[PDB]
Every structure is written in structure tokens, then in C-alpha cells.
Amino acid sequence: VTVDQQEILNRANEVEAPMADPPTDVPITPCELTAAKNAAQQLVLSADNMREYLAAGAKERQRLATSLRNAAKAYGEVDEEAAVATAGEPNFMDLKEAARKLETGDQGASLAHFADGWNTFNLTLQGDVKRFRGFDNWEGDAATACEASLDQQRQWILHMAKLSAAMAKQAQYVAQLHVWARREHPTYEDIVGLERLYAENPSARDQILPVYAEYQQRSEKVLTEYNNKAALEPVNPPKPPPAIKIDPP
Amino acid sequence: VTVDQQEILNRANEVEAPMADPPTDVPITPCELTAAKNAAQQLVLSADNMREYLAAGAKERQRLATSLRNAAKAYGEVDEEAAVATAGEPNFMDLKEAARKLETGDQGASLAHFADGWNTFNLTLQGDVKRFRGFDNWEGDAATACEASLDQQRQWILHMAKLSAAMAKQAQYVAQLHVWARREHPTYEDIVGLERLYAENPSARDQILPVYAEYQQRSEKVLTEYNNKAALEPVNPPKPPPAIKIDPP
Amino acid sequence: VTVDQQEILNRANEVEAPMADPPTDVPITPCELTAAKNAAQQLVLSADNMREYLAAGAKERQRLATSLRNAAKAYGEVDEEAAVATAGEPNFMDLKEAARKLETGDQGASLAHFADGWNTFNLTLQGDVKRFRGFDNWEGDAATACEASLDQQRQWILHMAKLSAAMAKQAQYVAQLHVWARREHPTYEDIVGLERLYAENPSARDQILPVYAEYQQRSEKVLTEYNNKAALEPVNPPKPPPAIKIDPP
Amino acid sequence: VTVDQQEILNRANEVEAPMADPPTDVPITPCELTAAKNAAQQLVLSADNMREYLAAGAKERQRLATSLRNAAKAYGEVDEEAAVATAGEPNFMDLKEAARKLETGDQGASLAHFADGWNTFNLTLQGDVKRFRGFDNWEGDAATACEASLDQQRQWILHMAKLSAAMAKQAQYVAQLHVWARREHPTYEDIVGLERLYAENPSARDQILPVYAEYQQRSEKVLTEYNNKAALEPVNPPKPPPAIKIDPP
Amino acid sequence: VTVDQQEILNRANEVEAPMADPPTDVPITPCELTAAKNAAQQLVLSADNMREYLAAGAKERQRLATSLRNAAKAYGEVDEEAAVATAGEPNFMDLKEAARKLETGDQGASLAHFADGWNTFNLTLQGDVKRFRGFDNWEGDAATACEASLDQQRQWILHMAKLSAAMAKQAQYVAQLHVWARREHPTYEDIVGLERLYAENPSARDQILPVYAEYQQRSEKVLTEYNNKAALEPVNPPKPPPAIKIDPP
Amino acid sequence: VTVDQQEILNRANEVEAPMADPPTDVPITPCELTAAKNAAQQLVLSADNMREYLAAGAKERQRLATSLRNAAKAYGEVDEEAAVATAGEPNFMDLKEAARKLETGDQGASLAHFADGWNTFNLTLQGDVKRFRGFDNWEGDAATACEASLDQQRQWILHMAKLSAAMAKQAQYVAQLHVWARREHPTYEDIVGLERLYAENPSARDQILPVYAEYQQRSEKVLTEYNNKAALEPVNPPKPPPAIKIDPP
Amino acid sequence: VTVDQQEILNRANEVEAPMADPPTDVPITPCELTAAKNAAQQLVLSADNMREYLAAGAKERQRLATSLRNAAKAYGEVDEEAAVATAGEPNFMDLKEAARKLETGDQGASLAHFADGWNTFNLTLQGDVKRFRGFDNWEGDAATACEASLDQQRQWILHMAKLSAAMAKQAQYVAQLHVWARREHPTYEDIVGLERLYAENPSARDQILPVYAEYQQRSEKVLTEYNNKAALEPVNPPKPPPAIKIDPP
């Protein structure tokens, strides 16, 4: 019905305008435990996957804009503008090492900043999908296939926003886990103090001994818990759907 | 059986009469927590999606009315009418900041007004579906395909009403969460009072210290809970089914 | 085997005899809460849907009777017979308003009458399905297709009876919810009495204050519970299956 | 292998010999509650459905016997042998009415007799399926299709026996529910006695009042429970499978 | 590869050698309760089904042996070798009758003997399946189809063994239920003794009365429990798979 | 690419080299209870099934080696190298018999040795699957089909190892059950001692009687538990996949 | 669009560059229990499977690089550069043996080192998948099929990383199980001490005897628990997807 070729060209420019940049904050391990460091490296890898697939999606949108320009060419002309030591003795050396690892590092501040950035990116991605709306005037069959391709791009972007939210939730979960670990695990200073209450009271040991044994058991329940809850699934984003290909007329 | 062309024309006008406008209330964050603000922005985005897809549905109904007019043209004539500082000291600065964020903002009044508007819209949408009923007299095959298309429009509208209800439930859930957070989290004035009971009693500290430690723990359980329950799924409405296309005779 | 054309004609009259009328009681909101009023309006809408689809089913049965008459015409002749103010003070104004809304209205009597009518209609519908039985003597292929069409009408009617039961259960559930809400929510007279025990004892307030705080908390747990359990699904009856179409011979 | 035509004729007579009659006991409501009466009417309707579908199955078996006679005709000759008043006062009038309804009627004796009859019918139906066994000597393709048709009749009869058991279980469930209701609901004589302990002791009321309030609450929990557990699903038996049709030779 | 016709003939004799006879013990009701008698009759019917289907399987194996003999005929020659009174008073007459029914009958000895026989039959059936093994030398396509048919016979026999185990478990379950019923239900002699402590102490009744009421309640919980757990599913064995048919050469 | 016929011949010899022999330990019943003996016989039968299917798999591998030799023949030449008494009295005779059965037999030592052998066989089977690896140099279509056939043999062997583990777990479960039964069931010597404390104290019986009644109840809970947990599923190994057949060239 | 043949050649070299070597640490049994040794052998076998399938994947990548070189040959020229004793007495000999087995061996240090190596390998594998990205300039149909083949290689590598994580979790689970077993099982020195408190106090035995019986029961609960939780599933990696085959031009 005297198709607006200009509408198609304008939508082609709008489709492949750059979207907001994903965050680039680096999540640091909250402590020196191996499970914590592995969780941080998993988060780094997942953020790398997200950035790579977002760039791939921008390439898909560029191809889609090209196909829309080719479809607009079927109505005429386009003016292309742009060109140990002892048996039986309390360890205290493993307990002390566990506490030392738990209290070294930023305790999860980096994780929280990471999660805030990706939650913001989830909202930002959801805000930028008017570029995939249907057309006002253009109809037919090039139009319907183009509309389906744009809606596929929209669904993929929404899925990417959901994955951003999931990765941010994972970072927050690891941060909460570290906070819980700091709370129930016995303090380094408490351990050192109880260790001096075993070299400054050979007499008193039958009060010091069960206390140590409590501390030991708590340490074991924390580290083990830390090791099991901290294993994270990698985020595995789907590849963006291939744009509809439309040859020049 | 001497088909009522007039019935088809009347149904065409009735199908694409404007439906009730969706609500336009803006949901405000109930507090200054990041989770609360992100929940409010998620609600804003979901309401935007709902309004956009409702407008798209009205366009689909306009196309359907055109197809019904074309089908009526097969029986003759239509008269087209219309044209920090220290180690080991109590923080009190993070606790105080948490309380300050919890008590600033409207505490959920805006959320409740938002939810009421969308619940009302759910009922309003369900009340406006007589326009998709079957025909009295028209039968045949244009009639049956047209009836199927109208029932598809009806099912899509019912699904949109259900989604309106779901979004309103989400707003109410966030409001209830904020109310719970206000209840169990320690008050700003209680925190300030306990902080003056630590600069006006250096003596008394071994009674003040565990009390603080209780407050701290409660603060941590509230904020964390607030952060996890407040993440909302976006509302993702299905695109309205394409109207049946019927060319002029 | 010398087919009883008379049996087919008699079954045609029996198929489209009018069934019992659905109930027409209007369910009133049991109170002035918004959730209660929305539940009542949802029930009104669902009853409207049920009445509309039952009328559509009667139209389907009329078409089926016509097809049976056409099938009877293949054996000969048919003789067509028929032609707030202060910070820190107790509210008492929200508590009092909540109680006032809870005790105004019929408290669920209308809901119970509604539910009784629809439960009776469930039984009534199940009692009227002998009209869809198979035939005594007529066999063949018109007969088998007609029998299948009648059984489809029977299954649809049974499903409608089941939906009637479900809607009645929903009305009873809302009535039971309102009864529970009346029980645990603090009485209006108790609230007014406790409010006069705060203007006639400035002295006594440190006994009055926690009592209020209990009442407040109970009010919050009731209203919130009322708001969440009272959201009802709309009843969405399936469209009656299209009758088998059989042209005159 | 010189097929026993006589075996086929004997099996034809055995297939359509009359099976045991279903029970005809009428289940009466155990009390005057609406839920109880509706449950009894549901049981009456389900028993009607069962009797109707059993008669339909006997008709199917008669058709099957005819098809077996037609199949026997392919080997030769068959000799066809056969030819309120105040605010704030205790009700006592709703409580008393509830007790009166609970204790009137047979208390479930009729339900138990109904259930025994249908359980017996379940066993009786399972005992009568030797008539659907495979053939001794007849083989081929008429024989295999006939064997499949007989096994379909057997499976349908077994399903009907299972449904008989289910309906009997429903009757027993309603009877057990009424027994539980009689136990926890406050007695009519206890209610009348407590009501005379409120007109023969205006003094004593602050001991009588909470007692009433207990009774009231118990009444509400019983009736409501009675109303919810007593809603029964209708028994919906499948139509018997159509017999294999075999024309005379 | 110079097929062993003798191996096929030997396997034909081995396939249709008689298997072990199923047990023929009759399970008797453990008591005089209706639920117990119905459970015993259900077990009788299930054992009848099992015996009937086992005989049918032996017929299938006989047909399979015939098909193997026909397949062996394709290599040459086979030498065919073989040729109440008062209101308000304690009942004591229903309680006494319940106890009398519970203690009459063999208390489950017959059930245990039944279950032992069928468990033994499960093991016996599993021990007799070497007759369905694959062939040593015979290969090709008659051989592969014959091997598939033999494996189908093996799978059916294994399923029948599993069903034998299930039926034995049902008998054991009913026996255990009766033992539990004997334990918690009040003894006949205890009932008679308490009934004489109500005609030999009109004085003492306010100690006798609650005791009776306890007994009554226990009786009701036992009989009801007995009625619900004792309903058994019929065992419904699948028909044996049809043997592969192979005509003489 | 100048296919290594020698590689195919070497793989043919490696494929059908004998695998490790399955264990041959016989599991003995741990006691004289019928459930224990039936469990032992079930284990014997399952081990028989496993040995039979493992021998069948070795035959399948021999056929596969033949097919590989035939495939190697397509490149030229292969040099074929190789050529009671009283009512109301305590029983003590059933209790004593139960204890006697529980303590006779090896108490599960044979079961543990059986389970160790089959767990070892699980590991042994998993260690011998390098013979099913893909080929170094041979490619094409005979090679790919041969590789698929070898991988099918590998998957079947892994499934057989898993079944070996499952059968060993069943043996360990029965052994643990017998150990539990020995612990909670009353000792034979304790029973005999308590029986002499009933013939050497007619006076003392009202202390002896409840004690017996405790023992009786414990006996009943053990034997019943022993009977229900000891029923074992037969191990039903899948038939090995048929080797790919490849005729000589 | 003047395809970059050089890009395809560079990607061919990048695809089949060697990936990081899997770890080669040998997991040792943490103790002398049979379940522990079997778990260690299962871990050894699973690590062997992982190493074998990783080498197979490298072979698949080498084939893929060859196919990419063949596809690059369709645009011209490639310069191939590279060329016991008593009844009734306490055992103490089984208890002592159980403790001795529990405390011998490295107690799980080897398991922890194994798990760390494989968790590191999981992260390492996820870091090396840029070699499977899509192409910059090459498009068409060889390009799209090649891109699909590369993405299949990527998905298989990600699955292998996930399996590495799972195997490491299994090793950590067995290590945690052994730690729990050491904690609740009675110490060897405690057993020896209690055994000397039975040869140096014949008097005292009625205090020593229940203590032993406690120890015995604890031993039984530990070993049994150790035996059941320690059975590990083998890791069964999928075979790498076959590379796309592309013949020279």
C-alpha cells in the first residue's frame, strides 16, 4: 500500500545502533581458600562468555540491518549515506592456616560490585528492545519474515538479560557464603589466643583440650561447607539466532 | 441462508472499538536499597512491555476488522461510512546506613497503588470479550475461519489479563517484603541510641557489645533476605496472534 | 435393517429440548476489602462466562438436531411439524479502618447461596445426559458419526458440570477465607476500646503500647493473608465441540 | 485344520449370556447437611452411569456374538435355533441447627450397604471373564481379529470392575467422614444444656461464654471440613469398545 | 554353514517341555470382616488369572515349537517321532460383634502359605528360562526371527515371575494387616469383662463410661483402617506374546 | 590412505581375546528364615543370569572379530594363522523358633564374599575396554560402521559392570538387613531364660507377663521387617547388541 | 566477498594447537577398607576414561583442521608449510581390625590433590575455547557448516569440563566421607585401652561390657555407612562429535 521504504531504512539504522556496553568489573576472590579462588575464576570465565556472545549478537544485528536494506531495495532506490610434628597433639597449624585464609582478601566487596553491575546490565538490556518492534506500514512477506527475525533477536536479548541476572545471583551467593563462613568459623585471634593458653598452662590442658576439639570440628564444618556450596555452574549463553538473509534484489 | 452482511459489518465495528486503557501509575521504589530500586525498575519495564503488547493487540484487532469487512464484501456492497577506621570496633556506620536506606522512601504505597490498578485492569480485560463471540447467522467457511480468529484474539486477551494479575501479584509481593524488612530490621533510632550508649559508657561496653552483635546479625539477615526475594522475573507477554487475512473479494 | 426413521426424529427432538437454566444468583463481596471485592467481581465474570458458553452449547445442540433431521431424510420423508499526624505514635486509624472494612458487608452469605446454586447445577447437568445415548436400531455410518457427535456433546456437558463444581468451590473458599479473617483479626470494638485506653490513661501507656503492637501485627498478617488467598483464577470453559454437519440428502 | 465351527457357535452363545445384574441399592444421605445430600446425589448419579454403561456393554457383546456367528458361517451351515436478634450475644441457633442436621438421617448405614453391593459387584465382574478367552482350535485371521475383539471386551469389563471398586470406596469415604463429623462436632443435647446454662445463670456467664466460643469454633471446623471433603468426583465410565463387525459371508 | 537341523529339533522339544506347575493353595479369609473376605476373594481371582495366563503361555510355547519344526524342515527331513434398644447407652453389641469377627478364622495362616507358594513359584519360573537361549550354530534370518520370538517368551515369563512376587506380597500385606488389627483392637474377653462391669456396678458407671468410650473409638479406628488398607488391586497379567508363525516349507 | 590391514587384523585378535572370568562364589542364606533363603536363591539366579549374558557377549565379540577380518579382506590377503496347646498362655514356641532361625547359618559372611567378588568384577570389566577404541589409520565406511559396532560393545560392557555393582549392592543390603535383625530381635538364650522364669516362678508371673509381651512384639516387628525388605528384584541384563555383520568380500 | 583464505588457514592452525594437558595425579585410597580401595580404583578408572576421551577429542580437532584446509583450497592455493574363640565374649578383634584399617593410609590427602588438579583442569578447559569462535569474514555454506562443526567441538569441550568438575566432586566426597568415618569411629588406642580394661579387671566387667557394646554398635554404623556412601558412579564421557569431513576440492 505504497510501502514506506523510508521506514525500513530507518529501522535498519535503529536495529544495529550500538547497545549499552556490558560491565567490565573484575570479580576478585573474597579469600585465599581454593574454593573461593575457583569460584572467582569461574565468574571471570562466565563474564568472558557473556561479553563474547554479546559481541556476536551485535554482529548478528549488523547482518540483520543489511538484510533489511536489501529488502528495502525491492522498492526502488537507497542512497547509501555512510561509507605433623607429634602424634596426639593439637594441630593448631591447620586451624590457624584456615583462619588466615578466611580473613585475607576483600571479603566479597568485589563480588558485590560485580553483581551490581550485571544486575544493572539486565535492566539495561530489557530497556533496549524497542528496536525489535514490528513495522507500522510495511507488510507482505519480506515484512513478515523480517518481523519474525526481529522477534528472534528480541527473544535472544531477553534470554541474555536473564542470564545476566543469573550470573549476578551467583556472585551474590558466593559473597553470602563467604560472610557465613566468616561468622561460624573460629577467629584467627581466638585461635592464637587459645594456642597461647596451651603453652602458658601445661597444667590447664584438660580444660583447653575439648575447647580446641570444638574449634577443630567447627573449622571442618566450615571449610567443607565452603568447598561444596562454592562450586558454580558456568554460564553458557546460547548463540544468537542467525539473522534472516536477504540478497540484494 | 441469506447471510446477514449487516451482522458482519456490525461485528467489524465492535471488534476494533477501543478497549479500556491500561493503567499508567508509576511504581516507585519503597526504599533506597539497591534490591528495592532494581525491583521497581523491573516493574516499570514489565508495565512498559504490557502496554506495548496491548497496543500491538489493538493493531491486530484493527487488521481483523479489515478482514471481516473484506469477507462481508463477498455478499455484495458495503457503504464505507468513515473516511574502616579501627580493627575490632563495632561498625555502627554500616548498620546505620542500612537502617537509613530501609526507612527512606514511600515504604510501598506506590507499589500498592500500582498493583490495584493492574488488578482492576485484569477484571476490566475479562469484562470486554463479548466482541469475540461467534456469529448468529453467518456460517460457512469464511465464517468458521473468522470465528477461529476471533477466538484466538479472545484467548490472547485472557492470557494478557492473567499476566496483569501476575504483575500485580509481584508488586504486592515486593511491598510485603519491604514491610517484613521494616519489622525485623533494627530501627535507625534504636541504632543511634545504642551508639550513644557506647560513647557515654566506656565502662559499660561488655553489656553493649553483644547487643550490637545481635543487631549486626539481624541486619545481615534482613538485607540478604531482601536481596534474594526481591529479584523479579520480567513479565514477557506473548505477541498477539496474527489476524486472519482476507483479501477484498 | 429397515431403519427406524422415527427413532432418529424422536432423538432429534430430545437432543435440543431445553436443559435446565443455570443459576442467576449474584455473588456479593463479603466485606469492603479490595481483595474481597475483586474476588466477587471475578466470580461474577466467571458466572457470566459459564452462562455464555452454556447458551453456545444449546446452539450447538440445535445444529446437531438439524443434522440428525437431515440424516433421517435419507430414508424418505419427514413431516416438518413445527413452523500521618505524628511520628512514633500508634496509628489506630489504619487498624480501625481495617476492622471497619472487615465487618461491613454480608460476611459471605451471598457467596454461600451462589455456591449452593452452582453445586445444584452441577448435579442437574449430570442428570440430563440421557439425550446423548446411542441409538437402538439405527446403525451404519451416518449413525456412527452421529453417535460420536452426541458423545462429544456429552463429554462437553460433563466438563461443564465439573467446571460448575469448581466455581462453587472457589466461592466457598472465599467465604471460608473471610470467616477466618473475621476470627483472627482484632475486633473494631476491641480497637476502639484500646484507643480509649490511650486517651484515658497517659500514665498507663507502657502497658497499652505492646498490646497495640500485637494488634497491629495481627492486622498485618490477616490483611496480607486475605490479599493473597483471595486472588481467584477465572473459570475458562472450553468452547462446545462443533456439531457434525450433515446436509439435506 | 478342519476348523471347529461348533466351537465358534458355542463361544457365541457364551459371549452374550447375561452377566450378573449390578446392584440397585439406593444410597441415602447420612444427614441433612447440604454437602451430605449433594454427595448422596452424586453417588446416585454415578450408579446410574454405571448401570447405563453396563447395559451398553451387554449390547456390545450381543453385536460381538452376531459377528462370531457370521464368521462361523464362512465354514458352511449354521442351524439358527432360537427365533440475628441481638448484637454480641451467643448465637445458639446456628449451633443448634448444625447439630440437628448432623444427627438426623441414617448416619451412613445406607452408604455402607451401597458400598458392600458395589464391592461385591467388582468381584462378580472379575469372576465372569472366561467368556473372553482365546479359542482352542480356530485360528487364522477371522480368529485373530475375533480374539482381539474379545480381549478388548475383557479389558473393558476389568476397567468397569475397577470403577465399581472406586465408587464403593467413595461411598465408604463419605460414611467415614460423617462418622468423624459426629465425633468432633458438639452434641445437640450438649448445646441445649449449655443454652439452659445461659438462661438459668445470668450471673455465671463469664464461665459460660468461652465454653460457647469453643463450641462455636468446633462447629465451624466440622461443617467446613464436611463441606470440603464431601465433594465427590463423578464416576465417568468409558464407553465399551465397539465390537468387531463381520458381515454374513 | 551346514546348519544343525538337529539342534533346532532339540530346541523345539526343549521349548515346549512342561514347566513347573503353579501352586494351587487356596487363600482363606483370616477373619469374618467383610474387607477380609473380599481381600481373600480378590486373591482367589488373581490366582485364577495367573493360572489361566500360564496355561495360555504353555500353548504359545507349543505353537513356537511347531514353528521351529517348520523352520527346521527347510533343511531337509524331520522324522516325526511322537504321534438400638436405648438412646444414650453404650452399645457393647457392635463392639462385641467387631471383636467376634476379628478373632474368628485362621488369622492369616492360609495367606502365609499362599504367599510362600507363590514366592517359590517366582523363583521356579526364573530358574526355567534356559529354554529361551539363542542358538549355537543356526544363523540367518529364520534363526534371528526365531531368536527374537524366544526372547519375547523369556521376557513374558520374567514378567509373570514378577507378578507372582507381587501377588505374594499382597497376601503378606493382608496377613500383616490382620495381625496389626488383632493387636490394636480391644479383645472380645476384655469387652465382655467390661460389659459385666456395667451390670454388676450401676454405681461405678462414671469410671466405666469413658473406658468404654475409649474402646469404641479404638474399634472404629481399627475396622476403618482394616477396610481401607485391605482393598487389593487385581493382578492383571499381560497376554503372552504371539509366537512367530512359520508355515511348513 | 594406504589402509593398515595389519591394524585391523591386530584389532580383530584384541577384540575377542578372553575377558576376565566372572566370580563364581555361591551366596548362602545368612539364616533359616524363608525370606533369607529366598533372597539367597534370588542372588543365585541373578548371578546365573549375569554369567549367561557375559558368555553371550563373548560370542558377540567373536562374531565382531569375524566381521573385522572380513572387512580387512577387502584390502587384499589375510594369512589365516590359527586353525497351640492352651488359650491365653504365652507361646514361647514361636518366639523360640524365630530366634533359632535367626541365629542359624553363617550370618552373612557368604553374602559379603559374594558382594566383594562382584564389586571387583565391576572394576575389572571397566578396566578392559581399550579393545573397543577407535582406529588409528583405518577410515571410510567399513571403518565407521565397525567403530560404531565396537562402541556398542563398549556401552554394553559398561552397563554390565553397572549391573554387577547393583547386584553386589543387593547382597550387601541383605547382609546389613540380617545384622539389623540380629540386633533388635530378642536372643534365643534370653528367650529360654525368660521361659524358665515362667516355670520356676508361678508366683512371679505378673512381672514375667508384660516382659514376654514386649519380646513377642519385637519379634513380630523384626520378622515382618525382614520379610519385606528382603524381597529382591532379579537382575535382568540386556542382551548384548548384535555385532555388525560383514560378509567375506 | 573476496573470502579471506588466510583467515581460514590461521583458524586451522589455531583449532588443532595442543590444549592443556589433563592432570596425572594418582588418587590413592585413604584407608585400608575395601570400600575405600574400590572408590580409589573407580577414580583411577574414571581419570583414565577422561584422558582417553580427551586424546580422542584432540584427534577430532586434527581432522577438523584438515577439513578447514580442504575448504580453504576451494579459493585457490595453500602453501603447505609443515612437513571366633569363645561364644559370648566381646570380640575386640574385629573392632580392632576395623580401627586399624581406618587409620592406615594417607587419610585422603591424595584425594584432595586429585580433586584440585581436576577442578583446575575444568577452569583450564573453559578458558581454551576461543579457537571455536565463528569467522570474521568467511561466509557461505562451507563456512556455516564449518561454524556448526566448531560449535559442536565447543559444546563437547564444555561438557568435558563439566565432567572434570563432577569427578573432582566425587573425589572430595570420598575424602569428606573418610573424615567423617575417622571422627565417629572409635579410636584404635581407645579400643586397645578398653581391651586392657578387660584383662586387668575381671571384677569390673559389668561396667566394661555395655561400653564395648556401644563401641561395637558405633563401629557397625560407621563401616556400613562407609560401604554405602563410597560406591561411586563411573564417569562416562561422551565420544567427541565427528568432525565435518570436507574432501580436497
Curated annotation (Swiss-Prot), chains A, B, C, D, E, F, G:
Q: Name one GO biological process term.
A: biological process involved in interaction with host
Q: Which keywords does UniProt give here?
A: Acetylation, Secreted, Virulence
- PTMs per UniProt: Cleaved in the C-terminal region by MycP1. The exact location of the cleavage sites has been the subject of conflicting reports. Likely translocated as a full-length protein into the periplasm, where it is proteolyzed by MycP1. Proteolysis may serve to limit the secretion of other ESX-1 substrates.
Is the keyword Secreted in the record? yes
| Subunit record text | Mature EspB oligomerizes and forms donut-shaped rings. In contrast, the full-length protein does not oligomerize. Interacts with the C-terminal region of EspK.
Q: Per the entry's comment, what about the domains?
A: The N-terminal region contains a fused PE/PPE homology domain. The C-terminal region is disordered.
Q: What more is known? A: BTP15, an inhibitor of ESX-1 secretion, decreases secretion of this protein without being bacteriocidal. BTP15 inhibits autophosphorylation of MprB with subsequent up-regulation of espA and decreased secretion of EspB and EsxA.
Tell me the protein family, please: Belongs to the EspB family.
Q: What functional role does this protein have?
A: Required for host-cell death and may support an EsxA-independent virulence function. Secreted processed form of EspB binds to phosphatidic acid and phosphatidylserine. Inhibits IFN-gamma-induced autophagy in murine macrophages.
Q: What is this protein called?
A: ESX-1 secretion-associated protein EspB
Q: Which organism is it from?
A: Mycobacterium tuberculosis (strain ATCC 25618 / H37Rv)
- Record gene name: espB
